[PDB]
Structure 1
Amino acid sequence: ALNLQDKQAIVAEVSEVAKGALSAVVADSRGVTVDKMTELRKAGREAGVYMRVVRNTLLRRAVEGTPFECLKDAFVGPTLIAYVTEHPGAAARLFKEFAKANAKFEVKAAAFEGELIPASQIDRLATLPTYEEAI
């Protein structure tokens, strides 16, 4: 049973990490075992990404403070967030291989530069290399 003191606390934690991160991936995680999840939670901490399954009412609140205030229409259906804090990219590629290899889910919408990325044009943040490539 989630209390309001606890609901406000979850909004706070995801509001803080919202400003800090660079690129974020919003996706479906239906019909996938915890065996595959603890696997994507390992390669997620390695790539410098923040993984979370947050209540969509709670997310529309911790994203109203911008620059993700276009991820609104992505808070329909089950949502997992991939906030990339250390180096932009990482997750937008970590998820794409997980989506094809498991066949379950589709991946909703991505966010970078404070702009909307549809389910079709997720090839932009999936081809990007390192930071750390310009030298």
Structure 2
Amino acid sequence: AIETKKVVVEEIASKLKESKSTIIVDYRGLNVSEVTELRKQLREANVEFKVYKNTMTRRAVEQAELNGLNDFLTGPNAIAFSTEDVVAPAKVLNDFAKNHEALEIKAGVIEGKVSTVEEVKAL
């Protein structure tokens, strides 16, 4: 599976310039809901801030075994990578704080990712 090599290599580049990341739900992935997490990011910049659903624990979590190992306990849970290269968080970490609390899929008892070293309350 030499195709699986290349997905490992390229996503590392936005993981060494990264500070933050957030859990992204994969059930009920509406087309307009994808727009309300991509086009609000496309009001910021390009596709640096990611939605990708190639996120098995054995496909793409082997790649993230270096940076910020706070994430494996949602292993048997819905994972999608959201990595960051530019525009530090002052606005971007609260992208999910309005839509998902009732619309564009459920809030999701999300237990978070790297904020500093914690689990809950992505601020």
Bin of the TM-score, shorter chain as denominator length: 0.7 to 0.9
Any stretches of 5+ residues in structure 2 without a counterpart? none
State the identity as a percent.
Answer: 6
Residues 107-133 of structure 1 deviation map (CA, whole Å, 9 limit, x = unaligned)? 4412133x2323xx23xx2xxxxxxxx
- What residue identity is the alignment partner of 2:115? F
Taking a change above 3 Å as real, the CA distance of residues 71 and 89 of structure 1, as seen in their structure-2 partners, is farther
Question: What is the aligned partner in structure 1 of residue 69 from structure 2?
Answer: 69
RMSD: 2.2
Question: What is the aligned partner in structure 2 of residue 6 from structure 1?
Answer: 3
Which secondary structure does the structure 2 equivalent of 1:37 belong to? helix
Question: What is the aligned partner in structure 2 of residue 99 from structure 1?
Answer: 100
Q: 1:91, 1:58 → 2: CA distance? A: 26
Q: Taking structure 2 as the reference length, what is the TM-score of the superposition?
A: 0.76
Question: What is the aligned partner in structure 1 of residue 84 from structure 2?
Answer: 84
Q: 1:29, 1:89 → 2: CA distance? A: 25
Equivalent of residue 113 in structure 2, options 110, 113, 131:
110
Which 4+ residue blocks in structure 1 deviate beyond 4 angstroms?
A: none
Residues 48-100 of structure 1 deviation map (CA, whole Å, 9 limit, x = unaligned)? 5511223222232111122x212111232222222232212433201121212
Taking a change above 3 Å as real, the CA distance of residues 76 and 91 of structure 1, as seen in their structure-2 partners, is farther
Question: What is the aligned partner in structure 2 of residue 45 from structure 1?
Answer: 42
Deviation at residue 102 of structure 1 after TM alignment:
0.9
Greater helix percent: which structure? Answer: 1
Question: What is the aligned partner in structure 2 of residue 35 from structure 1?
Answer: 32
